[PDB]
Scaffold this active site. Sequence first.
Site, PDB file in Angstrom:
ATOM      1  N   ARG B  37       0.844  -1.291   0.058  1.00 38.98           N
ATOM      2  CA  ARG B  37      -0.046   0.045   0.056  1.00 38.98           C
ATOM      3  C   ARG B  37       0.854   1.177   0.026  1.00 38.98           C
ATOM      4  O   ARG B  37       2.019   0.993   0.015  1.00 38.98           O
ATOM      5  CB  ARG B  37      -0.921  -0.183   1.147  1.00 38.98           C
ATOM      6  CG  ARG B  37      -2.352  -0.533   1.090  1.00 38.98           C
ATOM      7  CD  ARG B  37      -2.843   0.512   0.139  1.00 38.98           C
ATOM      8  NE  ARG B  37      -4.279   0.646   0.823  1.00 38.98           N
ATOM      9  CZ  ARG B  37      -5.105   1.695   0.692  1.00 38.98           C
ATOM     10  NH1 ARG B  37      -4.574   2.745   0.362  1.00 38.98           N
ATOM     11  NH2 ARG B  37      -6.167   1.850   1.394  1.00 38.98           N
ATOM     12  N   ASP B  70      -4.034  -4.102   9.088  1.00 41.61           N
ATOM     13  CA  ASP B  70      -3.262  -3.224   8.529  1.00 41.61           C
ATOM     14  C   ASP B  70      -1.759  -2.921   9.619  1.00 41.61           C
ATOM     15  O   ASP B  70      -0.832  -2.608   9.095  1.00 41.61           O
ATOM     16  CB  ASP B  70      -3.918  -1.672   8.145  1.00 41.61           C
ATOM     17  CG  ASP B  70      -4.838  -1.965   7.114  1.00 41.61           C
ATOM     18  OD1 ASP B  70      -4.294  -2.360   6.201  1.00 41.61           O
ATOM     19  OD2 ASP B  70      -5.931  -1.376   6.928  1.00 41.61           O
ATOM     20  N   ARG B  71      -2.103  -2.505  10.743  1.00 42.51           N
ATOM     21  CA  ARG B  71      -1.347  -2.222  11.928  1.00 42.51           C
ATOM     22  C   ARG B  71      -0.779  -3.459  12.685  1.00 42.51           C
ATOM     23  O   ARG B  71      -0.978  -3.812  13.753  1.00 42.51           O
ATOM     24  CB  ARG B  71      -1.861  -1.096  12.937  1.00 42.51           C
ATOM     25  CG  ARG B  71      -2.120  -0.074  12.101  1.00 42.51           C
ATOM     26  CD  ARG B  71      -2.559   1.224  13.038  1.00 42.51           C
ATOM     27  NE  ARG B  71      -3.771   0.781  13.822  1.00 42.51           N
ATOM     28  CZ  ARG B  71      -4.981   0.791  13.659  1.00 42.51           C
ATOM     29  NH1 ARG B  71      -5.225   1.328  12.297  1.00 42.51           N
ATOM     30  NH2 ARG B  71      -6.102   0.388  14.236  1.00 42.51           N
ATOM     31  N   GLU B 196      -5.110  14.419   8.477  1.00 37.34           N
ATOM     32  CA  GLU B 196      -4.477  12.955   8.100  1.00 37.34           C
ATOM     33  C   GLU B 196      -3.803  13.135   7.105  1.00 37.34           C
ATOM     34  O   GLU B 196      -3.959  13.912   5.995  1.00 37.34           O
ATOM     35  CB  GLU B 196      -5.499  12.058   7.943  1.00 37.34           C
ATOM     36  CG  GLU B 196      -6.681  11.923   8.989  1.00 37.34           C
ATOM     37  CD  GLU B 196      -6.185  11.142  10.033  1.00 37.34           C
ATOM     38  OE1 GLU B 196      -7.246  10.622  10.806  1.00 37.34           O
ATOM     39  OE2 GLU B 196      -5.359  11.018  10.220  1.00 37.34           O
ATOM     40  N   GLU B 197      -2.435  12.479   6.815  1.00 35.55           N
ATOM     41  CA  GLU B 197      -2.074  12.253   5.751  1.00 35.55           C
ATOM     42  C   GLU B 197      -1.721  13.143   4.830  1.00 35.55           C
ATOM     43  O   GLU B 197      -2.201  13.112   3.519  1.00 35.55           O
ATOM     44  CB  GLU B 197      -3.276  10.823   5.070  1.00 35.55           C
ATOM     45  CG  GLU B 197      -3.294   9.774   5.881  1.00 35.55           C
ATOM     46  CD  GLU B 197      -4.111   8.739   5.189  1.00 35.55           C
ATOM     47  OE1 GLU B 197      -5.030   9.264   4.333  1.00 35.55           O
ATOM     48  OE2 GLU B 197      -3.842   7.549   5.491  1.00 35.55           O
ATOM     49  N   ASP B 213      -9.024  15.701   5.354  1.00 29.97           N
ATOM     50  CA  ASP B 213     -10.270  15.876   6.474  1.00 29.97           C
ATOM     51  C   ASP B 213     -10.882  14.657   6.572  1.00 29.97           C
ATOM     52  O   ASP B 213     -11.738  14.488   5.642  1.00 29.97           O
ATOM     53  CB  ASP B 213     -10.958  17.324   6.252  1.00 29.97           C
ATOM     54  CG  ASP B 213     -12.072  17.252   7.430  1.00 29.97           C
ATOM     55  OD1 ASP B 213     -12.841  16.514   7.631  1.00 29.97           O
ATOM     56  OD2 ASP B 213     -11.906  18.512   7.948  1.00 29.97           O
ATOM     57  N   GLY B 217     -15.153  17.527   6.145  1.00 24.30           N
ATOM     58  CA  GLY B 217     -14.767  18.356   5.331  1.00 24.30           C
ATOM     59  C   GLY B 217     -14.512  17.266   3.876  1.00 24.30           C
ATOM     60  O   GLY B 217     -13.885  16.384   3.970  1.00 24.30           O
ATOM     61  N   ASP B 243     -11.866  16.165  -2.265  1.00 16.75           N
ATOM     62  CA  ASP B 243     -11.567  14.974  -1.385  1.00 16.75           C
ATOM     63  C   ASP B 243     -12.687  13.965  -2.184  1.00 16.75           C
ATOM     64  O   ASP B 243     -13.346  14.262  -3.016  1.00 16.75           O
ATOM     65  CB  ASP B 243     -12.287  15.155   0.093  1.00 16.75           C
ATOM     66  CG  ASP B 243     -11.451  14.233   1.262  1.00 16.75           C
ATOM     67  OD1 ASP B 243     -10.840  13.239   0.734  1.00 16.75           O
ATOM     68  OD2 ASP B 243     -11.870  14.297   2.387  1.00 16.75           O
ATOM     69  N   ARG B 289     -13.187   5.484  -5.102  1.00 17.33           N
ATOM     70  CA  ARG B 289     -12.103   5.631  -5.408  1.00 17.33           C
ATOM     71  C   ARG B 289     -11.537   5.163  -6.775  1.00 17.33           C
ATOM     72  O   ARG B 289     -10.449   4.365  -7.138  1.00 17.33           O
ATOM     73  CB  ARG B 289     -10.805   4.847  -4.408  1.00 17.33           C
ATOM     74  CG  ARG B 289     -11.155   5.740  -3.041  1.00 17.33           C
ATOM     75  CD  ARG B 289     -10.495   4.715  -1.888  1.00 17.33           C
ATOM     76  NE  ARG B 289     -10.091   5.686  -0.678  1.00 17.33           N
ATOM     77  CZ  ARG B 289      -9.595   5.191   0.413  1.00 17.33           C
ATOM     78  NH1 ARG B 289      -8.745   4.192   0.261  1.00 17.33           N
ATOM     79  NH2 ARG B 289      -9.405   6.179   1.544  1.00 17.33           N
ATOM     80  N   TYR B 323      -5.003   6.581  -3.170  1.00 17.23           N
ATOM     81  CA  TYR B 323      -4.345   7.499  -2.698  1.00 17.23           C
ATOM     82  C   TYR B 323      -3.520   8.125  -3.712  1.00 17.23           C
ATOM     83  O   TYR B 323      -3.168   7.499  -4.727  1.00 17.23           O
ATOM     84  CB  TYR B 323      -3.255   7.100  -1.492  1.00 17.23           C
ATOM     85  CG  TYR B 323      -3.891   6.757  -0.052  1.00 17.23           C
ATOM     86  CD1 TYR B 323      -3.121   6.675   1.005  1.00 17.23           C
ATOM     87  CD2 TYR B 323      -5.257   6.670  -0.101  1.00 17.23           C
ATOM     88  CE1 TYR B 323      -3.683   6.405   2.312  1.00 17.23           C
ATOM     89  CE2 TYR B 323      -5.912   6.459   1.360  1.00 17.23           C
ATOM     90  CZ  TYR B 323      -4.953   6.434   2.311  1.00 17.23           C
ATOM     91  OH  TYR B 323      -5.786   5.928   3.613  1.00 17.23           O
TER      92      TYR B 323
HETATM   93 CA   LIG Z   1     -13.391  14.056   4.018  1.00 13.71          CA
END
Ligand SMILES: [Ca+2]
Lengths: 389, 389, 389, 389
Positions: B37, B70-71, B196-197, B213, B217, B243, B289, B323
């Site tokens: 990823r 994932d973690r 984030e990110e 966000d 947002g 976004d 996405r 992403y």
């Molecule tokens: Ca958002």
Amino acid sequence: GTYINNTEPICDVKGFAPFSKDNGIRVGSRGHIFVIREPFVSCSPVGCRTFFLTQGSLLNDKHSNGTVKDRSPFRTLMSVEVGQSPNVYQARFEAVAWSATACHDGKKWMAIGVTGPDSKAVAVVHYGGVPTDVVNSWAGDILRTQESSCTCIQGNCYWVMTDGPANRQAQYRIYKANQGKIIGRKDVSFSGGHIEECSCYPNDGKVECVCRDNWTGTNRPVLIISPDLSYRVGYLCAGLPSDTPRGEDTQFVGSCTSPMGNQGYGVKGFGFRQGTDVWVGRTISRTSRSGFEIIRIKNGWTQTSKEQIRRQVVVDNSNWSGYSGSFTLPVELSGRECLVPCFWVEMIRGRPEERTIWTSSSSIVMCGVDYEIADWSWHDGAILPFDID
Amino acid sequence: GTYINNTEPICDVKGFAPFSKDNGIRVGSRGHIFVIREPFVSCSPVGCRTFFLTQGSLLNDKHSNGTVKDRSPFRTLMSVEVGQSPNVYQARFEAVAWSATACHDGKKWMAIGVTGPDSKAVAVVHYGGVPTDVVNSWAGDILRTQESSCTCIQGNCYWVMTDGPANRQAQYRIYKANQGKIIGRKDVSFSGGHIEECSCYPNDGKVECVCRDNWTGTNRPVLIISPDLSYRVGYLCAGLPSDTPRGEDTQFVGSCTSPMGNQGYGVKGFGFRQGTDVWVGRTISRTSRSGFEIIRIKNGWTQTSKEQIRRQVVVDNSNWSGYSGSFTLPVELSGRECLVPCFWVEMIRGRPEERTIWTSSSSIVMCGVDYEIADWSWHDGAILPFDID
Amino acid sequence: GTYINNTEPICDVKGFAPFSKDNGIRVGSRGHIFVIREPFVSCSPVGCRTFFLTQGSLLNDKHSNGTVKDRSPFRTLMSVEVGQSPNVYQARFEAVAWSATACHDGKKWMAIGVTGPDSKAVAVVHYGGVPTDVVNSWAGDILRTQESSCTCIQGNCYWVMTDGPANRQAQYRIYKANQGKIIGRKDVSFSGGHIEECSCYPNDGKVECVCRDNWTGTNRPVLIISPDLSYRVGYLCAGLPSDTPRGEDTQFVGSCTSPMGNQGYGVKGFGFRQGTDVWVGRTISRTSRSGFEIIRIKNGWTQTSKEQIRRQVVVDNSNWSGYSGSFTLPVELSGRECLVPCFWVEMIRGRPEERTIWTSSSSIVMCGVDYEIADWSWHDGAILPFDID
Amino acid sequence: GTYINNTEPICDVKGFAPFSKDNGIRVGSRGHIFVIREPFVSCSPVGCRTFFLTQGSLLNDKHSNGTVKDRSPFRTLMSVEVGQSPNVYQARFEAVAWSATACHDGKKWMAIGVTGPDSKAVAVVHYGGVPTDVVNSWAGDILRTQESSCTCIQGNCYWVMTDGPANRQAQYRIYKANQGKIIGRKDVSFSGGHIEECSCYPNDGKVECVCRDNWTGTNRPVLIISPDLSYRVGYLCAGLPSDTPRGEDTQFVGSCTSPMGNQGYGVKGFGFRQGTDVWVGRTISRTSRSGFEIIRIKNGWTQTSKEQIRRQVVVDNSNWSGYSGSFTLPVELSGRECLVPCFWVEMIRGRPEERTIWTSSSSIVMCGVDYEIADWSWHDGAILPFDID
Ligand SMILES: [Ca+2]
Ligand SMILES: [Ca+2]
Ligand SMILES: [Ca+2]
Ligand SMILES: [Ca+2]
């Protein structure tokens, strides 16, 4: 300017940060990954490498059948960069060996591999990719060495070897080399004491080793080597046993001079002096090679202390561990004024504990930092049995 | 002479030219390719690298089963040269990490990986291939970072981290480091705002970030960091939401200060200031996405502009995206007087959208040029399901 | 400073220490390893390499079917670092060749490959990775060369070639080259004598070769080449035959001038002058290519000596051996004042001796040291038949 | 000192010596080898590289199904060292491209890849591993280039592109670049003439190209480019046709100005001026891409000569060939005073000619020498069908 000094004190550290993890067995399910043991780490001025013993065989292949002797003629020492899996196509050849140590003096890599017959084995010293010297077995009983980084101070490199019985009195020697050539050796007098598979590091311009007692001690011997090869020898003073198998902590009385605990067997392990305190590694279980924890003992290098003041779990007691060993980061990579203490943990998978024809291991590497680090488990994570099983 | 300045303006560009494409999943049908990823790009004076998170597992192997967290403890940051597939035998180990950022200050690579437990995670800073510092979780809720290039100006390297809730108010920090060592941090005050990110780049001797966000947002927050760590924080002014998920363009009213659109969720994405205009990336679909388009807004960095003056499709809306993130080419590679703006798009394949046990992604990388570039689709192109399915 | 001198005497040595072992066939069960022959070693100032002939085919693949001609158009010379398996992804291309020699003059690698048709074959000289000259067949009968390291003294590199019958009188030439360009050749007059596949090394500023007689001699010819290309030619004086097949030792009378033993066939092999003594390699069996032993003969370079004073077994007579050849370590790697003598043994697996469609080999490399070294067997160790069988 | 001059004459040579052969398809039966086309060679001061177009897919995998468009979004330019197979784990990423050229100016590699849509395609120039410029399609009909080495003289690098119909009049341009940046272009006026896929080399400080006529000519066009971009354009004077398909030699009348032979179709091919003579490559068959021969024509660069004075077969007419192209060795590798002329032959395997789902190719590379070289066949040698078939 080329030789590393390594005359600096060891960094005083409150915790150990994850360096790398190779995931080697997991990748080996599909990729071309050597079957390994003893994945030790050692570093030069440009980077750290993971060394390992192979059998010339890959995971998921019939050659991984673990009926082959440990001390076989196929056994070789190879290396990759730290955190790379022990894969064939990135690997570097170091020595023919079923026992090894390696280290970098600042100019070249020195590598030492023991092979040949039990009764008259040969240690071949490599420097810069070629043989430069040898040590033949002096006691005709499985000449063998650290299975971890040797230690280099001011262009002179130091290691410890053992020749003799695996379960009672044996003989022990320390060696000194410059540019691939042995320039001194000393016999370590240690009657009633046993030494195997030492984990050593530089500190303050001496070599300190924390070794394995395979005779009667559930504590670990300690060896402190000066550059002229005078040494001090005894046991890690601390009142907590760090070998496996061992007895309960509550039962234990430490000793700066004698093995204690009166049990046989053992596992390679490590520790670091911190002024007068000590960090000590051990498996969590007292009876098997499961789990990994590191413990700091207040005054544990100079006294039979049981004063535990830090504990960080690195592998949980539900997961297989194995050997561990020490090394240090050079100042030129670390940028610090002290020698950062680091260690590696081997995580053994397959036979005996699990139903497989094979046995291999992977690793998690950790480095001392100036902060507490939380508990977690960086376990191997492979899913056995594999296809070849 | 060794540190990169990166004090120059960002190149003003009319379009984005194809840099590279790794074809990683397609090759993974037969070759030994990590399941990945976040395939982010970052560059040194000698070349650009693609970084990625692995699970220690390969495509077409049982370990690719995507039930793994994932973690997880197997999660590592590795890298290859730009356009190379994330294959095992060319890969370089960077950090143990389930969240990452990396960048090159002109002398060495700095890499930061977050691992350890949700409630007390550890960011380990690497510089030149070894740990040099850490940041522990300050809010005990999934310490995490950019998943893209951090930014280096005059030997000091900058990144943004978040600790706290994934779907409401969390806490945000910016960090500054020289030679692997943290030399300053600042808490970013942003009440009601979420970060984030972040996708950041240098421009005019500051760090500008366009972040995600995940609270309310459908517009993206913007963070502008001065070398003394004073910052400006708000939202990308433009009157088009970038976004995903988002509402229709026609509905949208922009805001330089507030999140707008009142929807949760999100995806990492990016944008580049062009004087007062902005280039903004987004998926084509507003709900998933899928697709990738880049749009230049006249005055969109300073005003709630809807003045669209350029649009280039890079992935068509029949194909999966994911992403995206930003980076820049150094002047010493580019040969220009400005910092060329570049981006990457991740193309996610497998679960959830497709019937597979696994999930991975590949990438298409693009760099700003002084010309319009035609629409096309540089999609992943793998043929699912795979054998292991 | 760049050219190697190699004008020093050969080190006088009491034994041979294990250098490396590639385990190539064992790894080939699962990894991507070329099917090879003639795994010869040669060294530069930075390291030693193993060269080998491939068929463009891998172990465990249908292309390994050994019905393909030895002198095929697919035949190429490639190399890896010493102790690396002949795997595809680490290999370096050297020449198109079904016969080869290579060596490093201190600045670049010189490589020579013979390919093309039996009746008019072409030797292409490579220097620094490109063709720089050629030698065409002068006798129109399988132009061919050492299949081992050529020898470089003061920037001028020397090798021996043969054109003519494989089982009776043929013609022999020595060649001299600087920077890839032939600067002299000489025809070696040797009536009734046969020369193939010479194993040469530098000693005292001349080239000494110990070659294979495939006509009537169970002893090995010796060729001593001065830099002006005057030569001395004869047979290794010693009263022990070192070819295979050979007659019993007890039967044998040596000869400094003539082939003795009156048997055909042969195997590439080697020897090293030690003042007036000689170390000689041979298979253990007198009738087949099984086993490997090295023997020092007191005065065996100057006299028909049978005075054996050292013997070290390197492969036991239960295991397959094959060709062997010589090389030396440069002074800049070894750190010594003399040229360390080293050799390699090829271990042939598969057809004819074993029930396989294929034939390949692996190697054990050894280097002279100042100590006796114990007997052992560093055999190939692969488990046949393989899957493709 | 860094830029290559390449202002020297082309070496006058009597023959062509085998340089390398990758055996790529044969290795691909088991190893991880890209499916390729156009394996062109180009060289720097340190070595020669083989460039190739991939589909992101490997041999023996379902992705090799050759129903995928040639001009697909997965198409990339990658490279390996000369004689290495186009394997994944040694490969270097160069550009996104379904048409390419590359060359090295003495300091860095310049690489040019055309991708994007037929009607508005984009050539992206890479220099030193990053985009530095672009050329957009000027005629909106498949912008395309040499598929071989471009040519670099004194730091300025030259190539030829075509935009327009594949089978009638199209438009042609020559381009000039320094350090990745286009510094001049010229439209080549050539009414009734067709130019594709030029094979160019430096000679005497100009660029000479021998290209492919896909409209009416079974002879090859010739383009001679001066550094100021004035050019001469016409046809290779010689009275032997070197395109495929072509008419019988006996029928043919050459022309220095016009296409002759009145047949469509074509194959990329090459030739080298030798003073006033010419070496010309062609397939053996006149009707298909089988065989490879090189012929020297006395006075064939200046006259409609049929005076054949040399002929060397490199692939026999029982074996598949394909495209061929030219390059030269730099003086710093070759050590000569002239530019050595070299070529490569692609050997196409699979669909159409053979019953496979896939199509790939391998190569044999050859370099001019001062000697006659015997006929032979260095053919691909793979055994089809493969497993995936
Ligand atoms: Ca958002
Ligand atoms: Ca014990
Ligand atoms: Ca014989
Ligand atoms: Ca034509």
